[PDB]
């Protein structure tokens with residue numbers, strides 16, 4: 001009834017995208033062949049949200065796989081669940097982006113964007129009532145960042161009354177050595193501020209720090225970082241997949257159109273070496289459990305959504321959510337009453353009896369944008385590596401515009417952080 | 423004759439409607455297939471229960487009701503539920519995209535696409551009536567459909583049915599059972615736009631019902647199912663005078679004459695007793711005096727407010743079950759000596775009493791104990807303005823920063839409607855103060 | 863009784879008109895909001911043509 005159309009672009013977008021479908025396919029009882037062999041009818045009640053019912057009663061992800069190189073997508077077809085994806089929904093080119101936003105947004109990506117939209121229309125027109133789109137991508141690359149923001153802008157032209165959500169992976173020096181990542185990220189944020197309703201800030205800095213400090217991984221792999229992303233995306237989409245739509249959920253989380261960048265959180269986060277409701281709640285409000293490298297106690301919450309999964313006492317959940325709010329009242333803006341909402345789903349994730357997923361619209365997210373801006377200006381005031389972008393036809397002003405737009409986003413977060421009721 | 427048409431709007435309206443019609447069927451002996459063995463007149467009749475039920479030639483008793491929602495999931499449960507055979511399919515109306523808790527989408531963007539079909543289906547119910555009395559509209563304040571589409575429907579009903587009476591059962595938002603943040607906006611918007619088109623509205627505070635279920639029925643974490651079964655009992659007490667008859671029965675319209683001193687002051691405070699579990703009702707007979715005393719315990723009110731800090735403009739007592747005037751009069755005399763009951767100086771102080779001898783029913787598997795006698799008090803007190811004050815204050819907090827307003831503007835509304843609606847509420851709060859001031 | 867008929871008819875009339883004006887004012891506002899959104903997106907499309915043209919010149 002309420003369908004979502006999923007898109008994954010670039011290496012990162014396709015990697016976490018594949019993991020997302022692995023995890024939710026398991027939760028819904030779908031095997032790599034697309035057949036259902038579950039044990040509960042709750043797994044199928046809202047399976048239409050993300051899957052199409054095909055001939056032979058096989059369920060096909062409503063997913064579109066995009067990349068300017070075939071490398072990663074070839075791994076998807078060969079990896080686990082590579083055969084459930086609709087083969088025609090693979091839209092790849094050979095040119096590549098070379099980690100250049102301009103090549104993805106303007107040059108190489110523009111040549112391919114039309115063939116991507118062709119698959120989007122065929123998927124959308126088969127929907128009884130399309131909720132909207134979710135995109136997985138990184139902001140430091142070239143395809144996911146450049147062609148992803150282009151796809152968003154062009155999808156919005158044909159579907160302006162549909163929700164556009166993104167799971168955007170922010171760059172960090174701790175994960176990738178590529179130098180121009182601040183440029184690609186700042187150019188992308190400039191786009192996401194305008195053309196998305198919800199953006200989950202999946203910060204590689206925070207993912208690494210969690211794997212290293214908490215999970216005790218000396219050398220975290222992309223697979224280790226992605227296990228966190230997979231569990232997070234499963235959590236934030238749980239209320240959509242198991243028995244409100246993207247719009248109602250955005251309405252209660254986005255008080256201002258530009259301030260739609262969320263801090264994801266998850267609990268429990270434990271290493272392979274060695275749980276109460278009070279502890280779950282305390283953890284998901286701890287800075288250590290945030291998938292964005294921001295301290296929520298350096299800002300204030302505009303809105304918060306929290307979903308608990310597993311068998312537990314709703315009364316105890318109600319008490320502890322009221323408990324943490326009163327003890328942290330200062331960090332919740334007064335001018336949005338009742339801005340913390342809670343949901344429960346009886347079905348826990350895989351390998352856990354209880355979990356909690358945190359979605360925070362906190363002004364503390366400015367710390368993340370401030371970090372990207374610092375890296376950006378440290379390279380743009382020298383005009384370093386700019387020839388990669390002017391070579392594609394860009395002008396220095398577009399770099400200056402994207403810069404000052406993100407600095408405005410920061411000052412806008414600071415405005416409402418300092419605002420008071422009286 | 424004197425038919426009433428019920429209109430259930432949005433999730434809260436539909437689910438509360440399900441509970442009410444289930445309870446009505448049990449009270450009248452109607453089976454889930456619409457058959458009523460005790461009814462010896464087949465295909466028609468002028469009995470008291472015919473105010474709420476029509477009859478087909480095959481002996482089916484069909485609610486005079488329309489269910490409307492902008493998404494189908496809630497009404498689908500009616501189409502496949504136990505009482506699915508009770509409703510003709512045309513009485514259940516659904517879109518496919520809801521209002522997303524946005525008044526603008528319920529009143530404009532989405533609502534305008536279905537409003538014509540809804541009015542057409544209501545007309546078909548009205549055409550079956552020989553003397554239509556009015557409409558009963560069930561809806562939430564907080565939902566985008568309950569707020570936005572209800573306002574649109576009420577405006578349209580005034581046009582199509584003149585000043586035929588329209589009564590509301592409105593669910594006032596409570597944070598304990600809501601996951602929406604923009605409910606203060608939707609509440610003020612719908613209250614402003616509906617105020618001219620409603621003759622009388624019974625607000626039900628979800629927090630008050632939530633507290634009663636926890637305190638009096640020992641339910642740890644009430645669900646909508648728990649709240650709705652209790653709400654259905656109060657609704658039943660209020661409509662019992664229309665569906666049953668008796669020598670001591672007083673029609674709801676006659677109570678309304680006393681409850682509404684000015685058109686805008688049409689929000690009665692309901693208080694219901696006894697709410698008691700089976701375990702406590704065992705070897706426990708609550709007398710007329712005991713349930714009457716409970717009416718003046720604020721914890722049993724449908725809306726959280728303090729009548730002791732306001733003034734009364736009317737007090738009505740709707741009894742049902744084993745109750746005779748002698749005991750009522752004795753109970754009332756006792757209460758007048760021990761309670762803070764201050765009337766405005768321009769209104770008589772007598773209590774208006776009605777008795778419906780039919781005893782109340784309970785749904786199987788419920789938590790409410792079956793009792794021999796119950797009572798619903800309907801009072802017009804200035805204290806109900808406290809509910810407007812709390813809601814208006816949450817409105818002001820968010821609107822001073824224009825939080826979430828872009829969602830409404832994006833769907834076509836203007837900031838002028840927000841300030842215009844808030845000013846109407848400020849005048850309403852002012853109206854409630856003025857009525858409580860002593861005369862010159 | 864004539865006054866009663868006139869007041870009821872005038873109430874019906876003013877409500878019918880008040881609503882007709884609200885629903886038209888809302889239609890125009892929503893249509894304008896969506897038109898401005900697309901106009902911004904077309905402007906970006908034009909800017910993309912200039913970028914691809916600026917590349918060609920450098921060659």
Ligand SMILES: Nc1nc2c(ncn2[C@@H]2O[C@H](COP(=O)(O)OP(=O)(O)OP(=O)(O)O)[C@@H](O)[C@H]2O)c(=O)[nH]1
Nearest residue numbers: 432433434437520521523562564565566567568646
């Ligand atoms: N008492 C009671 N309140 C309910 C029920 N369902 C929803 N509510 C309340 O109604 C408000 C939300 O409005 P809904 O009726 O669910 O929304 P809707 O009318 O369907 O409108 P949209 O879904 O936004 O299109 C919240 O304050 C809920 O607590 C119910 O079954 N019983």
Ligand SMILES: Nc1nc2c(ncn2[C@@H]2O[C@H](COP(=O)(O)OP(=O)(O)O)[C@@H](O)[C@H]2O)c(=O)[nH]1
Nearest residue numbers: 010011012015138140141142143144171176222
């Ligand atoms: N968490 C995570 N981050 C990734 C992955 N692959 C790439 N990245 C990040 O994304 C950025 C590189 O962008 P990439 O997606 O590889 O470029 P693209 O293929 O042109 O879209 C770097 O900052 C990486 O840290 C992945 O599998 N997981």
Ligand SMILES: COC(=O)Nc1nc2ccc(C(=O)c3ccccc3)cc2[nH]1
Nearest residue numbers: 134165236239249305306307341342343
């Ligand atoms: C694909 O992108 C998305 O899934 N978007 C999205 N936005 C959301 C907002 C909230 C929630 C909740 O779980 C929730 C928890 C408690 C109360 C209310 C809601 C889930 C969301 N999912």
Ligand SMILES: [Ca+2]
Nearest residue numbers: 461463466467
């Ligand atoms: Ca009959």
Ligand SMILES: [Cl-]
Nearest residue numbers: 514515516517
């Ligand atoms: Cl329908």
Ligand SMILES: [Mg+2]
Nearest residue numbers: 011012099141
């Ligand atoms: Mg790469």
Ligand SMILES: [Mg+2]
Nearest residue numbers: 432433520567
């Ligand atoms: Mg609804």
